[PDB]
Structures are given as structure tokens and as C-alpha cells.
Design a protein around this ligand. Sequence first.
Ligand SMILES: O=C(O)CC[C@H]1CCCN(c2ncnc3[nH]ccc23)C1
Length: 167
Amino acid sequence: VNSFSGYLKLTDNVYIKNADIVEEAKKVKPTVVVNAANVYLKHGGGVAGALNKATNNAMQVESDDYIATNGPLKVGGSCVLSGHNLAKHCLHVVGPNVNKGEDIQLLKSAYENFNQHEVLLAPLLSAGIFGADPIHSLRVCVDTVRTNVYLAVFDKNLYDKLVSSFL
Ligand SMILES: O=C(O)CC[C@H]1CCCN(c2ncnc3[nH]ccc23)C1
């Protein structure tokens, strides 16, 4: 038993809700919140900009030190950093950005990072400003993640289309 509430169950291990991931993180304090990161951990907009704003820019300060030490992530890769006031940990995961021409096949590699964590609150990778089809992203998630994932979908209209079209 865990503290996630109001989710629709899609499969044995994947759940979904119309929610603002920032507000969900603020209430649940999950062990892991996933950020929709880029390779530079520049949290300017989308999910990343919203998560970072909610930390009063502490996420960005920590991220800049991480990059200065380690260099950029790989597309499809991830790193574990602090969850600040939102979660114990933040798993920064880089899905391919279609608006940069990155290979959508890397989306599966991106979701594989979730399997290193027993339970996660997450957005749909490569959705939103990353330019991928969220229905495809959900399919890859279901077919790749084996750990327990709670997906927060900000847009109510999108949430209804994902549910109604789910196979
Ligand atoms: O319609 C969706 O979910 C997909 C849109 C992407 C794009 C970036 C922001 N998107 C979010 N997803 C969940 N929570 C959020 N809070 C603030 C933004 C946010 C995900």
C-alpha cells in the first residue's frame, strides 16, 4: 500500500491521473519524482521549469554543479539528484526531443531508467514541449517499465484521450 490517490489503473504496474506533477509531488512526497530533463539539466520550461520553480531554483543550482563536475547526460540517460521539497529524490530522465530531431527509438532507453526504482511519480517522457505523441509515449511506458509508475498528466483533455485510446 502507498499514498497515491485517485489514479486509474492501466496495467499491473502502470497508473495514471490528471494532475499537476508539482502539486502531486508536494502532497505525496514520493520517494522518486521524475523530471523531463534535457542533457544540460537546464530546467527552463515544461515539466522541468515547473519542478525547478517549485524548488525556488534549488534544483537548478544543484544541477549546474552536477553538470560542471560530470558533463552532460546522454539522450536516453538519467541521473539521480535531490528531490528538494518535492520528493526524496529526483530522477532526471532525458527523453528524445523531437523538436531537436532526436531519434524516437531512444524513448524506450529513457523509460528503462525507471526500472531502477521500485515506485515513481512521473510525467510522460518526450511529451509536451519535447514534441512526441503522448499516446506513443504511454505505449512505450507500459511496454518498458516493470516497476510501479504513477503518471501525472497535466492537461485534462489529453488525459481523457490517453485513457479512451488505451489498448
Ligand atoms: O499533457 C501532458 O501531460 C504532456 C505535457 C508535457 C509537457 C511538459 C509539461 N507537462 C506536465 N506534465 C505533468 N505535470 C506538469 N506540471 C507542469 C507541467 C506538467 C508534460
